[PDB]
Design a protein around this ligand. Sequence first.
Ligand code: HEM
Ligand code: HEM
Ligand SMILES: [Cl-]
Ligand SMILES: [Cl-]
Ligand SMILES: [Cu+2]
Ligand SMILES: [Cu+2]
Lengths: 106, 106
Amino acid sequence: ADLEDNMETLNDNLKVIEKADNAAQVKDALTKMAAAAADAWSATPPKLEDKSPDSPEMHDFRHGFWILIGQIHDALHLANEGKVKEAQAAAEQLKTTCNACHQKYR
Amino acid sequence: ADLEDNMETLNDNLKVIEKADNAAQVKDALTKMAAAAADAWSATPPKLEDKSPDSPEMHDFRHGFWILIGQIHDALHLANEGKVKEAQAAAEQLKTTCNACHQKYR
Ligand code: HEM
Ligand code: HEM
Ligand SMILES: [Cl-]
Ligand SMILES: [Cl-]
Ligand SMILES: [Cu+2]
Ligand SMILES: [Cu+2]
């Protein structure tokens, strides 16, 4: 529930998806990711600790989780359509969204 | 952070949106809604208290917030395009997602 644990869950489940052999394994990992991002939403990263809760930076930080949550859902839908490799590929591409936030706020 | 508080935030800001006369009012209310939904993600509703956290019903409960969060985002994007009335209309139509969950799980 702290920001570290949420980030590990995100990281770990990205690796679970990469190594997965069926759609159920992918779905489970993706829902775990979504829950971690949702929980991360209310956090203040150390580098934005001096900004007000409703500053543009804090809004944008939260928006970074918003984008990720949408994209995790896109990958979930691919898995439900039986597109295992495509869902795995979509999950890998999530790193772009991971990195976008890290570059600004980590 | 309770399920009650989160539902009030959601309800109250839906009313703020309806009464809004500018884009900024609509944007702010929508982000507060998204934050409440994200926070509600980890909750177990009274009716699903005897179900396991990874039961289909619990996944579907969480999925209800997932759908809502995407739809709030859609309304947010309308506002950012300057389509204020359209964003207000989109926010009002969120109620069907509100009700979809209430019907199953409230
Ligand atoms: C699936 C996507 C993501 C993955 C796999 C991921 C992974 C990680 C990992 C493993 C760490 C700790 C290791 C390190 O700092 O070197 C970390 C830190 C961090 N992440 Fe992420 N992350 C993701 C998405 C995001 C997003 C979307 C945001 C912002 C909205 C974010 C914000 C941060 C911040 C602020 C830290 C530093 C934490 C601290 O120092 O307390 N991350 N991330
Ligand atoms: C913007 C849409 C929503 C609005 C305006 C809203 C509003 C409310 C309000 C005012 C209440 C308290 C009144 C009552 O219980 O009669 C409530 C309760 C509740 N809502 Fe919602 N809600 C929304 C979305 C959702 C969603 C998407 C879910 C499911 C994922 C959900 C699940 C629940 C549950 C389980 C309760 C009862 C909680 C308890 O008794 O402890 N709501 N909602
Ligand atoms: Cl911390
Ligand atoms: Cl499969
Ligand atoms: Cu879905
Ligand atoms: Cu957006």
